[PDB]
Amino acid sequence: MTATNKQVILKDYVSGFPTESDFDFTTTTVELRVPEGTNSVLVKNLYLSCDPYMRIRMGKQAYTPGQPIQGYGVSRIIESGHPDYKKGDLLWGIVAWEEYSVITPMTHAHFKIQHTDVPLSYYTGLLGMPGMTAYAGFYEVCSPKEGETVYVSAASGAVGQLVGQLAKMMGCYVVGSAGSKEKVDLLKTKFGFDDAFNYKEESDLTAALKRCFPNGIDIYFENVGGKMLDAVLVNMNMHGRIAVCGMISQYNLENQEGVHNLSNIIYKRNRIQGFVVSDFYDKYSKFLEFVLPHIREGKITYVEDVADGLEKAPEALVGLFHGKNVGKQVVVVARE
Amino acid sequence: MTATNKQVILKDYVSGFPTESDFDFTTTTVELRVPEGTNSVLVKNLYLSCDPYMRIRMGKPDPSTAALAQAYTPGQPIQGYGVSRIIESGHPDYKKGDLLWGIVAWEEYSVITPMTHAHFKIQHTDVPLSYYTGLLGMPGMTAYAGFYEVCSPKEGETVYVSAASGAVGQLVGQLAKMMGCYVVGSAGSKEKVDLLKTKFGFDDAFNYKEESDLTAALKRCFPNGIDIYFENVGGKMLDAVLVNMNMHGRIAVCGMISQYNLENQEGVHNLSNIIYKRNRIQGFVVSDFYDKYSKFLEFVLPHIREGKITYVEDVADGLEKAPEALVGLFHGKNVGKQVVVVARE
Ligand SMILES: NC(=O)c1ccc[n+]([C@@H]2O[C@H](COP(=O)([O-])OP(=O)(O)OC[C@H]3O[C@@H](n4cnc5c(N)ncnc54)[C@H](OP(=O)(O)O)[C@@H]3O)[C@@H](O)[C@H]2O)c1
Ligand SMILES: NC(=O)c1ccc[n+]([C@@H]2O[C@H](COP(=O)([O-])OP(=O)(O)OC[C@H]3O[C@@H](n4cnc5c(N)ncnc54)[C@H](OP(=O)(O)O)[C@@H]3O)[C@@H](O)[C@H]2O)c1
Among B256, B273, B272, CA closest to A257 = B272
Cβ-based interface (< 8 Å): residues of B facing A: 56, 64-68, 234, 238, 253-256, 259-260, 265-285, 288
What are the structural domain ranges in chain B?
A: 1-134+312-345, 135-311
CATH of domain B1-134+312-345: 3.90.180.10
In 3-state terms, what secondary structure has residue A42?
Answer: strand
Q: In sequence order, which residues have a C-beta less than 8 Å from that of residue B154 and are 6 or more positions away?
A: none
CA dihedral B71, B74, B77, B80 (to 10 degrees): 20
Distance from CA of B70 to the nearest CA of A (A): 11
A155 in Cβ contact with A188 (< 8 Å): no
Element (H, E) at A307: strand A304-308
The per-residue b/e assignment along A1-25, b for 16 or more CB within 10 angstroms, e otherwise, is eeeebbbbbbeeebeeebeeebbee
Approach to solving: X-ray
Contacts of A119 (CB under 8 A, 6+ apart): none
Cβ-based neighbours of A178, under 8 Å, separated by 6 or more? A154, A155, A156, A184, A186, A187, A196, A198, A199
Tell me the CB-side half-sphere exposure of residue B326, using CA atoms within 13 A. 29
Amino acid at site A15: S
Fold of B135-311: Rossmann fold (3.40.50)
Q: Give me ligand 2 centre to Cα B147, in Å.
A: 16
State which fold the A126-302 domain adopts: Rossmann fold (3.40.50)
Residue in A256, A261, A276 closest to B269 by CB: A256
Task: Inspect the interface and report whether the beta carbons of B283 and A265 lie closer than 8 Å.
Answer: yes
> How far is the C-alpha of A162 from the C-alpha of A160, rounded, in Å?
6
- As a dihedral over the C-alpha atoms of residue B207, residue B209, residue B214, residue B220, rounded to 10 degrees, the angle is -20
d(CA A124, CA A120): 8
The alpha-carbon gap from B284 to the nearest alpha carbon of chain A, in Å, equals 5
Protein fold of A1-125+303-336: Quinone Oxidoreductase; Chain A, domain 1 (3.90.180)
Interchain pair A270, B285: CB under 8 A: no
- Distance in Å, alpha carbon of B118 to nearest chain A alpha carbon: 17
Alpha-carbon distances, residue A175 vs A155, A199, A214, A299 (angstroms): 9, 12, 12, 18
Asked if residues A136 and A163 have their Cβ atoms less than 8 Å apart, the reply is: no
Q: Which of B254, B293, B338 to mutate to test the pocket of ligand 2 (most atoms within 8 A of CB)?
A: B254
Interface-testing mutation among A263, A265, A269, with chain B (most B C-beta atoms within 10 A):
A263
